[PDB]
Amino acid sequence: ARSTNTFNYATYHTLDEIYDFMDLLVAEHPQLVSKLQIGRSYEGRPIYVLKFSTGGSNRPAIWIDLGIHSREWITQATGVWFAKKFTEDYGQDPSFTAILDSMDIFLEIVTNPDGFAFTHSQNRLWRKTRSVTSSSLCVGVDANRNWDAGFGKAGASSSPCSETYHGKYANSEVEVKSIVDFVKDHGNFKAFLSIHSYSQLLLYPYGYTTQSIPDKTELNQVAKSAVEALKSLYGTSYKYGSIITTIYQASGGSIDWSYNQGIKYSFTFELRDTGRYGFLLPASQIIPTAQETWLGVLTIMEHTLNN
Ligand SMILES: O=C(NO)N[C@H](Cc1ccccc1)C(=O)O
Ligand SMILES: [Zn+2]
């Protein structure tokens, strides 16, 4: 691919192809997109975040991370499509244009690069990071159980070999701490969205406690509107609700942390499908998934802008 216009959005890519894609996009829209490095992975790979902005200084921002669980390939594929979509819709779509004229968007397409490379090289179903534990032969931590929100509590495992191992201590994984520091230093984030797969669900806090959030009524209606918008394209059916009541108890989650930091609009998406293909979703469903997911995400962005 020599231009983001010749890039194949209908197929799965490697880490190098996604990283090259980032530089092409920045070179093509220098006035709108910029690439930031917020840290390095355990194995030394750079951790990139794309910033979409039309100016200003520390404007209210929207955070979107995809691929924290490496085997969920549909998310990184959706992230690349999203990045391109932002550059094409600005100045064409009234709604999105108004959003970008007042807010900045931070997009992290590959949140767990070490795991992503491993899924391409050794094990397609690997989900954790690749950090080495002092006294154990098992590798990795579940990056979505390593956050400082009910850390170490029921809903995660203390065994290094577990698929849901929470780690030695909150923020022990550099891939997580890098996001924590960035968001805290910025201090003006209004929405925080984490993209996962699969099961077709839209969730809001909390996952580690049965306690209801003070903003339940509002987020519940925002979530309802988002799924209605998402379903309008191809009829894909989504369920919504808090993490603990919709799935089960889970500790150390990212949106539980972001919400406790004051970021009101914290949501987690679980994309296609409902089990037919699971994590191995066919390449031919990449674009349809991205297109419908976009409508749901845009709906939450619109709400964030007016409140
Ligand atoms: O199967 C998946 N894919 O994300 N996630 C499950 C359920 C989940 C989703 C979102 C938040 C907390 C818990 C898991 O144990 O990680
Ligand atoms: Zn996941």
Question: From CA 116, how far away is CA 127, in angstroms rounded?
Answer: 8
Question: From CA 134, how far away is CA 245, in angstroms rounded?
Answer: 36
| Structure token pair of residue 101 | 């004229």
Angular region, 30: left φ>0, alpha ψ -120 to 50, beta rest = alpha
Can you give the length of the chain in residues? 307
Which ligand is nearest to the Cα of residue 68, counting in written order? 2
Closest CA to ligand 1's atom 4: 196
Question: From CA 241, how far away is CA 227, in angstroms rounded?
Answer: 11
β-pairing verdict for 46-52 and 189-197: unpaired
CATH number of the domain within which 15 lies: 3.40.630.10
* Beta strand segments in the chain, E: 33-40, 46-52, 61-66, 104-108, 189-197, 201-204, 239-242, 265-271
> Where do breaks (C to N over 2.5 Å) occur in the chain, by preceding residue number?
none
* Amino acid at residue number 20: D
Question: From CA 174, how far away is CA 166, in angstroms rounded?
Answer: 13
CB neighbour list of residue 220: distance below 8 Å, 6 or more residues apart: 204, 240, 241
Q: Which residue(s) pair with 192 in the sheet?
A: 63, 266
| Structure token pair of residue 152 | 């170490």
Q: How far is CA 56 from CA 60, 64, 276, in A?
A: 10, 20, 46
Which ligand is nearest to the Cα of residue 256, counting in written order? 1
Query: Minimal CA–CA distance to 110: which of 138, 164, 72?
Result: 72
Burial 57-90 (b: 16+ CB within 10 A, else e): eeeebbbbbbbbbbbbbbbbbbbbbbbbbbeebb
CA geometry: angle at 140 spanning 153 and 210, to 5°? Answer: 20
List residues forming the annotated binding site for substrate. 69-72, 127, 144-145, 197-198, 248
User: What residues make up the domain containing 257?
Assistant: 1-307
Query: Minimal CA–CA distance to 122: which of 68, 70, 160, 46?
Result: 70
CA of 69 to the centre of ligand 2 (A): 5
Euclidean distance between the first and the last CA atom of the chain, given in angstroms as a whole number = 40
Question: From CA 112, how far away is CA 131, in angstroms rounded?
Answer: 11
Among 247, 256, 266, 268, name the best residue to mutate to test ligand 1's pocket (greatest count of ligand atoms within 8 A of Cβ): 247
List residues forming the annotated binding site for Zn(2+). 69, 72, 196
* Amino acid at residue number 120: H
| Structure token pair of residue 92 | 């064409």
Query: Minimal CA–CA distance to 15: which of 39, 42, 47, 40?
Result: 47
**Cα-Cα-Cα-Cα dihedral sign, residues 99, 104, 110, 112:** negative
Active site residue 228: no
Experimental method: X-ray
Count how many domains the chain has: 1
Question: From CA 37, how far away is CA 266, in angstroms rounded?
Answer: 23
Number of continuous H segments (helices) and E segments (strands) in the chain: 9, 8
Counting from 1 in the atom list of ligand 1, the atom nearest the Cα of 270 is 4
List residues forming the annotated binding site. 69-72, 127, 144-145, 196-198, 248
Question: From CA 216, how far away is CA 203, in angstroms rounded?
Answer: 11
Which ligand is nearest to the Cα of residue 247, counting in written order? 1
Question: From CA 155, how far away is CA 159, in angstroms rounded?
Answer: 12
**Cα-Cα-Cα-Cα dihedral sign, residues 70, 73, 77, 79:** negative
186 touches 216 (CB < 8 A) = no
| Structure token pair of residue 121 | 């090289």
> Which residues are close to ligand 2, an ion, with C-beta < 5 A?
69, 196
CA geometry: angle at 171 spanning 203 and 65, to 5°? Answer: 40
Given strand 33-40, what is the order of strands in its sheet? 33-40, 46-52, 104-108, 61-66, 189-197, 265-271, 201-204, 239-242
* Amino acid at residue number 2: R
Which uninterrupted H or E stretch holds 287?
A: helix 286-306
**Cis preceding-peptide flag for 9 (omega within 30 of 0):** no
Question: From CA 205, how far away is CA 267, in angstroms rounded?
Answer: 8
Query: Minimal CA–CA distance to 52: which of 119, 2, 109?
Result: 109
